[PDB]
Structures are given as structure tokens and as C-alpha cells.
Write a protein that binds this ligand. Structure first.
Ligand code: NA
Lengths: 66, 66
């Protein structure tokens, strides 16, 4: 588990990227977003998350807005 | 996706396993469950899901109650 910030997120398509200090960007899909409410993220939002490896490569899991 | 049947799920602990015919049971955590319903599952419940690799090995992602 670790922290990063949302780099960008396309609300219509429901995906974007989390930027990591000193590391590679991590893909995030709306299905990973935790909590109640409409599943979206805004640029600059601080998040915690896990990285998992799927058939398309690394992606975020368990994305919590801080 | 992929289909399976919940083998067991402990709603206090927040996890269980999904049985996959002719394959290994897959760990499922509550954070993977989709929908506005309670993030719980029950024995025998049919689900669709993605297998991803986490730091402890294979686990379910994108778990939808059918
Ligand atoms: Na970076």
C-alpha cells in the first residue's frame, strides 16, 4: 500500500492515472475506487492504493480518497 | 471476465474465497466487490470477476454479483 495523487481522470470514460513521487504512473479504473458515492476522481486528489498485475499490466486496487 | 461461485465469505472479516471449476480457489476481499449493495458475499453466490496478481498472489478484482 502507498500514497499518490490523481494525475488526470476522464470522468466520462471512468479511468485515469495516479502519479507517484519517484515512481511510475499507475492506471486507475473507476471499479477500484472505494467508498460511497459516484465513482470518480479529480486531478490533484490524494489517494492511497495497492498495485496489482492484470492481463493488461499493472493497475490500481483499493483506491481510497484521503 | 470469469465466473465462479462463492465458497465461503466471512462478513465480519471482510474476505473469503471463490471456487473456480477445475481450478484453484481465488481469494476475494470486500474491497473488490462492485455495486451499491453492502460489500458482502454469501456461500453459493454466483459471481463474475477478474483474476489479478497481488503481493500475496492471485486475488479477485471487479467482483459482480450475478
Ligand atoms: Na512520478
Amino acid at each position: 500500500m502507498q500514497e499518490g495523487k490523481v494525475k488526470w481522470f476522464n470522468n466520462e470514460k471512468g479511468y485515469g492515472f495516479i502519479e507517484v513521487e519517484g515512481g511510475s504512473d499507475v492506471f486507475v479504473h473507476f471499479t477500484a475506487i472505494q467508498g460511497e458515492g459516484f465513482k470518480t476522481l479529480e486531478e490533484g486528489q490524494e489517494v492511497s492504493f495497492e498495485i496489482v498485475q492484470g492481463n493488461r499490466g499493472p493497475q490500481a486496487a483499493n483506491v481510497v480518497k484521503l
